[PDB]
């Protein structure tokens, strides 16, 4: 059970390993209640052609 | 100090240890790089045409 009602993210399985950017990620414990990152609805941008 | 603390609650950005000019510079440099990348894509499409 993630904090602030968050669902777990979609774990992708690419066939080819890609070049990746390596940032310092924020977990759901690092986020606050009224932040931008709890309201992220990125699955509307999902496309298999992309 | 209150309005900067009001900025510290909307975006968190570690408010105890964050200067203000470094955060605005990275937003400015990303803004100039994204505007350069759009014009480079327009120049690449003009060359490919």
UniProtKB/Swiss-Prot annotation, chain B:
Disruption phenotype: Knockout mice show normal organization of the cerebral cortex with no significant differences in cortical white matter or callosal thickness. Histological analysis of coronal brain sections at early and postnatal stages shows unilateral ventricular enlargement. Widely expressed. In the organ of Corti, it is expressed at the outer and inner hair cell layers. Expression at the inner hair cell layer is restricted to inner pillar cells. Detected in cochlear spiral ganglion neurons. It comes from the Eukaryota. The modification Phosphotyrosine is found at residue 10. It is found in: Cell membrane; Cell projection, Ruffle membrane; Cytoplasm, Cytoskeleton; Cytoplasm, Cytoskeleton, Microtubule organizing center, Centrosome. Homodimer. Interacts with the GTP-bound form of RHOA. Interacts with RHOC, PFY1, MAPRE1, BAIAP2 and APC. Interacts with APC; acts as a scaffold protein for MAPRE1 and APC to stabilize microtubules and promote cell migration. Interacts with SCAI. Interacts with DCAF7, via FH2 domain. Interacts with NCDN. Interacts with OSBPL10, OSBPL2, VIM, TUBB and DYN1. The DAD domain regulates activation via by an autoinhibitory interaction with the GBD/FH3 domain. This autoinhibition is released upon competitive binding of an activated GTPase. The release of DAD allows the FH2 domain to then nucleate and elongate nonbranched actin filaments. Belongs to the formin homology family. Diaphanous subfamily. Actin nucleation and elongation factor required for the assembly of F-actin structures, such as actin cables and stress fibers. Binds to the barbed end of the actin filament and slows down actin polymerization and depolymerization. Required for cytokinesis, and transcriptional activation of the serum response factor. DFR proteins couple Rho and Src tyrosine kinase during signaling and the regulation of actin dynamics. Functions as a scaffold protein for MAPRE1 and APC to stabilize microtubules and promote cell migration. Has neurite outgrowth promoting activity. This is Protein diaphanous homolog 1. The gene is Diaph1.
């Amino acid at each position: 059970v993630l904090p602030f009602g968050l669902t777990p993210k979609k774990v992708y399985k690419p066939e080819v390993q890609l070049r990746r950017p390596n940032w310092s990620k924020f977990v759901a414990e690092d986020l606050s209640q009224d932040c931008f990152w709890t309201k992220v609805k990125e699955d509307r941008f999902e496309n298999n052609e992309l | 100090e209150t309005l900067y603390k009001e900025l510290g609650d909307y975006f968190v950005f570690d408010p105890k240890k964050l200067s203000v000019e470094e955060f605005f510079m990275d937003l400015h440099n990303f803004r100039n790089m994204f505007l350069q990348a759009v014009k480079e894509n327009q120049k690449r499409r003009e060359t490919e045409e």
